[PDB]
Structure formats: structure tokens, C-alpha cells
Amino acid sequence: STGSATTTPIDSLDDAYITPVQIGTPAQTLNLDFDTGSSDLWVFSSETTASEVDGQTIYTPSKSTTAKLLSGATWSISYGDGSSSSGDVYTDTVSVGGLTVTGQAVESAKKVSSSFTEDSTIDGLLGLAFSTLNTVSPTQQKTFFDNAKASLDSPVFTADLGYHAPGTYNFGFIDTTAYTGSITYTAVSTKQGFWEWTSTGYAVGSGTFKSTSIDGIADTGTTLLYLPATVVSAYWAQVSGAKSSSSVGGYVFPCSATLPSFTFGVGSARIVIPGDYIDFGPISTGSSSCFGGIQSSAGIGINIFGDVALKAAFVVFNGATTPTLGFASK
Numbered sequence: 001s002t003g004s005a006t007t008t009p010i011d012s013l014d015d016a017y018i019t020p021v022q023i024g025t026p027a028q029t030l031n032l033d034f035d036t037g038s039s040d041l042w043v044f045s046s047e048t049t050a051s052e053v054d055g056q057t058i059y060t061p062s063k064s065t066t067a068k069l070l071s072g073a074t075w076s077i078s079y080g081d082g083s084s085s086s087g088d089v090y091t092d093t094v095s096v097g098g099l100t101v102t103g104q105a106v107e108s109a110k111k112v113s114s115s116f117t118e119d120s121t122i123d124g125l126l127g128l129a130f131s132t133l134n135t136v137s138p139t140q141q142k143t144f145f146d147n148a149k150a151s152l153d154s155p156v157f158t159a160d161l162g163y164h165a166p167g168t169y170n171f172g173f174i175d176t177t178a179y180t181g182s183i184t185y186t187a188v189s190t191k192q193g194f195w196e197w198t199s200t201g202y203a204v205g206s207g208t209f210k211s212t213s214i215d216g217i218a219d220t221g222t223t224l225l226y227l228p229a230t231v232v233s234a235y236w237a238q239v240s241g242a243k244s245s246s247s248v249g250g251y252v253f254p255c256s257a258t259l260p261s262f263t264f265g266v267g268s269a270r271i272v273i274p275g276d277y278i279d280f281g282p283i284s285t286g287s288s289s290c291f292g293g294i295q296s297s298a299g300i301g302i303n304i305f306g307d308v309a310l311k312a313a314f315v316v317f318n319g320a321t322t323p324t325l326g327f328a329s330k
Helices: 114-118 144-151 229-236
Strands: 003-009 017-023 028-035 041-043 068-078 084-096 099-112 124-127 156-160 167-171 184-187 196-204 210-218 225-227 243-245 250-254 262-266 269-273 279-282 289-292 294-296 303-305 314-318 324-328
Touching: 003 084, 028 041, 041 084, 068 099, 099 144, 184 196, 196 229, 210 225, 229 250, 229 294, 250 294
Parallel strands: 028 124, 041 099, 210 303, 225 294
Antiparallel strands: 003 017, 003 167, 017 028, 017 084, 041 124, 068 084, 084 099, 156 167, 156 314, 184 324, 196 210, 196 262, 225 303, 243 250, 250 289, 262 269, 279 289, 314 324
16 A cells, blocks of 8 residues: 655645544545654544634544543653653554555544644644654553554555745655656664764765764754854854844854755765755744754754755655665755
């Protein structure tokens, strides 16, 4: 089997991407944030505290003939941006782009933090990291991908995120028309439960490539590119007037700037992030200070190849017995 679903930016900045997902019988379609940095599939629901719902579409298990309470199971998750959610668990039929999993754990939110409430466009998350990170207790649950894997034509999924445009998540096949040149594969460590890999270096603009190992995670659920302070300083030093602002919470730059590109290494291959991808616009409405899309990972504890990086590539998440990651230009 295979699946193919379009993923769409939630706003003009590509802050996140939503993908329609069918849950239950008859289908209830919710728009979920596919997150390769976490491993819970959770939804706004009929159980979510009413004051914490503001425009989201909810899953109502009582209206699904295939929903079953997973008795005694609870979940609770906290994300890197400080947001959180928690609740109880149902199993139900879940389909993505024509690919169906029966008995998928669907984590129903009883509580969500303010950032989730405030984002009316995101009806929940669909985790695509390794199932070892799943938070369901006392019986840990598998991700949608883990459950689908054995049925897939090939044990892979791909992320093809657009810049200010829709893109695609495919399951079970590699669309050879979706990228240019060849795919370069690189080793993954699953030790922390992430799609963790080591980039071979970077360049700023038309500058020379610096060969240096940068361990980080491929994380579709993180907006920006978070890299070591040394690398980030070298990037922003090439932008007149750019500075790190503790009041704003990172590097800002004059909105009048033209940003240089940023290149990262994948083995001997190179992925180029155009400068425009690094522009996250005015820090506040009408400001001439703009927020940067490359930020320091210092104090996160891990480097994160988030959407800014991933949307510059066609990315293969290879879930074979020994997982690997592939990157191609597009």
C-alpha cells in the first residue's frame, strides 16, 4: 500500500504545515501537524476543555462506530517550545492520503496549552519520530508510520514541504519526479528517539564550505533552523545590521536586507536554503525589524533541522531495519 497527502502552510510565514487526516467511521477529517520530532497522534476532541477550544475541528469518538476507549491509558506531552497537551486514548481507524491503519491510538486531548488554543488552524499533531518517544501510559503506543510500515510497498515516508506553497507527504514510495539529481542517504541514530543525523558542514552565501560535523534532528514540527552559536554568528555577520536581541528572543535583521543563502552538507552533497526562506518577517506588525529563520540552538541541547532547512529539500525518512535519511535538491 501507499498514501499521498498534500500539506499546506498555516499562514504566510510557513509557521507550520497542516495535512488532512481521516479519523473514525464515518470519517471525521482533522487537519494535523505532521511532526517528525514527536511520536504522539493527538487531537482536539469532544473531551477538550471547552475554554481551550477556539475554532479547531474536533474528533468526537462517540460518533465513530470504530472508536474504542483504550481503557486506563493516558498521555501527557511537552514540546520544545514550552507547549503541552494531555488526555486519554481511543483506538480508531486513521487514514492519510488513502493509506489506512486500523487500531491506531488516537490520543484525545482533555487539556491543551495556550499556544494550541490560539492556533485555530491546527486540529492536533501526528507524530512521526520513533515510537520509543510515545507518551501513552501504562502501555506505550505506536506511531501511524510504525503501524503502517509492514503494509507499505517500501518502509519509508517522504516530506516535500513547500516555500509559501503546498507540498506533499508520501507513505510507502519515493516519487522520482519530485526531486532533481540524486538522493544522498546518511546514517541515523535512534538513540534519542529522533531522526538524528550528522551534517557534514555549511556555507554562508557564496562563501567557502566549512567541513564540520553538526549532529541534529530532522524535525518537520519545528519552524526554524537551530544550529550552534558559532555557525549562526557566522551567518548573521554577513547581514548588515543583524544582531541577537534578548528582548525579542533571537537574531533580528533590518527588513530592508537581502539575506544570503545558507548551505548545509549531507555527505558530499549540498542543500542550498535560499535567503528568502530565512526571512520570518516583522517582529511585530509594522516593525522594520525582521525575525531570522536561522537561530542558535545553545540552551536547547540539540540542533534542529526544522522547516526552514527541510523545505529546501526532498527528504526521505527511511524506516528500514537500519533507518537512514535521504536528501535531494528539488
